[PDB]
């Protein structure tokens, strides 16, 4: 607090290492004065990816992470094998159907004004090359592929560029910068990570999962884009729905061809969620024998296939 009127901030950063290159993977923001001040931090001595935080106003938090890879799946004639990696305020994209680039380098590179927290791909069979990015300031940016790159200044070339080198590929361009508005204006929570498991299920529909703090309950949100007309740039994502579930949701999966959405609870029960229906009902997942399905143990990676 060098400035007299400056409001100090607290940040907790999670870093890892690669080929002797130090990445910046996660960033959490906390206040510094009042009930929100942090007193102590501690890593769990047994479980590798659990973090314990104790604040001042008799407040306790626990965070759980796991490793994952972000890839695109689509039709053979259209999809290019894509992989996105987070490096702080930049996102590195490698197109594996055309170039095979060692991990520290990349095919192209996207630059952002704030550190990035989540990266996801579209779930359309013929448009599986689009990208969505959510950063630490709670705004969602959308990058789409078109015939004309439009030469936006936020896209750079990696190892496929230089003086005299030329390779034919289609780079994306920025299209919107959405802003998320919640129910009225509130202090939210000392917890800075309220939207998790972000999933882009349609060119204007996102799904997110929020956790409660009194009962072991979870909420599924519907983020939809609303605009009166093409007034200007930027936009507004209005929460248009909310579904309540008993239990802790730990994974959400979707199928781009059959359009089915699957939820996993903390004990192992698998549920099917219908979003296009007017009832928004939730049902158990049935096997061939007509019985409900339960994983014997909590799985960390889930997928839906057609055997």
């Amino acid at each position: 607090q060098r400035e007299e009127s400056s409001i100090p901030k607290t940040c907790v950063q999670l870093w890892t290492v690669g080929n002797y290159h130090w990445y910046l993977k996660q960033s959490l923001s906390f206040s510094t004065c009042g009930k929100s001040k942090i007193v102590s931090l501690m890593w769990d001595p047994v479980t590798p990816y659990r973090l314990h935080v104790l604040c001042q106003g008799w407040h306790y938090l626990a965070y759980d992470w796991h490793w994952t890879t972000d890839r695109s799946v689509g039709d053979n004639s259209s999809d290019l094998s894509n992989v996105a990696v987070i490096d702080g305020n930049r996102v590195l994209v490698t197109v594996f159907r055309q170039t095979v680039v060692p991990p520290p380098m990349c095919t192209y590179q996207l630059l952002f004004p704030h550190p990035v927290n989540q990266v996801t791909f579209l779930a359309h069979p013929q448009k599986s090359n689009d990208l969505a990015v959510l950063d630490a300031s709670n705004q969602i940016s959308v990058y789409k592929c078109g015939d004309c790159p439009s030469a936006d200044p936020t896209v750079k070339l990696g190892a496929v560029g230089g003086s005299g080198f030329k390779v034919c590929l289609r780079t994306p361009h920025l299209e919107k910068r959405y802003k998320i508005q919640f129910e009225n204006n509130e202090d939210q929570d000392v917890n800075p990570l309220k939207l998790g498991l972000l999933t882009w299920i349609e060119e204007d529909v996102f799904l997110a999962v929020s956790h409660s703090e009194f009962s072991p309950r979870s909420v599924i949100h519907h983020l939809t884009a609303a605009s009166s007309e093409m007034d200007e740039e930027h936009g507004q994502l209005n929460v248009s729905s909310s579904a309540a579930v008993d239990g802790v949701i730990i994974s959400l999966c979707c199928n781009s061809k059959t359009k089915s959405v699957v939820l996993q609870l903390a004990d192992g029960q698998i549920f099917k969620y219908l979003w296009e229906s007017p009832s928004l009902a939730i049902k158990p997942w049935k096997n061939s024998g007509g019985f409900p399905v339960r994983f014997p143990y909590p799985c960390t990676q889930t997928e839906l296939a057609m055997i």
């Binding site: 002797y20 095979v100 991990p103 520290p104 380098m105 496929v160 003086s163 005299g164 030329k166």
Partner: protein, 256 residues
């Protein structure tokens, strides 16, 4: 340098992009008369490893070598009576290999995986040859390593090395979008030029298959417009046969 800094030294050597070489020569330290280290050893201030510790260390070091690196030699060749302290035996490599077999780990360098060595030390022959490619980053450049080898029996036949020129090249012939080939090699026994032997591996077309693939990476992935090769002289005639011309000390070819 103790017994714990050596492992860290070599782990950093093979994991840090600034260091990754193409070949290695391991020379355990020997103390010889008429040097400063000799004076240090007499004054009771320097002591060598015990032989068991040395064998264990060499086994652990050899377990870390990447599959694109070749080890040429494992110890010096000073006659035994002239050495005051240090290594005393003469077959450190095979003792280390036996110890590695005992511990359950395996060595996967280039020398101990090629057809001739696998043919004289063991008795095996390739059966199910396949094509393998490995990419990495080293010394500020994007390196690729192409090879033909048998996966099930772990047998190497032929290799090629390719690199995309960085932004700090000073040679006139390599500026403006040039990709350079650094080595092409096919192993086995020697087949004299213009001769053929159906029981050996050289003159059977594994070289023009490795160059056709190098010419596809350099044009569709690197985006270059020229390819250059460093070569000897008989290789100069060979590349002239393929379709390359001569410029300076290189054999170049347009890719447009």
């Amino acid at each position: 340098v103790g017994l714990e800094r050596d492992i860290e030294q070599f782990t950093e050597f093979f994991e840090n992009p600034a260091f990754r070489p193409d070949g290695l020569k391991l020379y355990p330290t020997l103390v010889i008369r008429g040097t400063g280290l000799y004076e240090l050893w007499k004054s009771g201030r320097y002591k060598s490893y015990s032989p068991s510790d040395l064998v264990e260390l060499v086994a652990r070091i050899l377990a870390l070598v990447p599959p694109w690196t070749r080890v040429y030699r494992v110890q010096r060749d000073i006659p035994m009576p002239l050495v005051s302290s240090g290594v005393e035996h003469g077959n450190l490599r095979e003792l280390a290999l036996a110890r590695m077999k005992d511990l359950g780990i395996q060595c996967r360098d280039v020398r101990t995986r090629e057809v001739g060595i696998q043919e004289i030390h063991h008795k095996v022959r390739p059966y199910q040859v396949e094509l393998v490619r490995r990419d990495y980053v080293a010394n500020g450049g994007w390196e690729t390593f192409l090879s033909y080898e048998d996966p099930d029996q772990d047998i190497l036949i032929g290799l090629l090395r390719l690199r995309k020129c960085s932004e700090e090249t000073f040679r006139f012939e390599l500026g403006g979008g040039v990709s350079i080939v650094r080595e092409l090699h096919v192993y086995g026994s020697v087949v004299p030029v213009s001769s053929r032997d159906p029981t050996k591996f050289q003159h059977q077309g594994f070289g023009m298959l490795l160059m056709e693939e190098a010419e596809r990476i350099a044009r569709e992935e690197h985006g270059s417009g020229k390819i250059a090769v460093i070569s000897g002289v008989g290789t100069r005639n060979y590349y002239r046969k393929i379709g390359y011309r001569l410029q300076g000390p290189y054999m170049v070819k347009m890719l447009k």
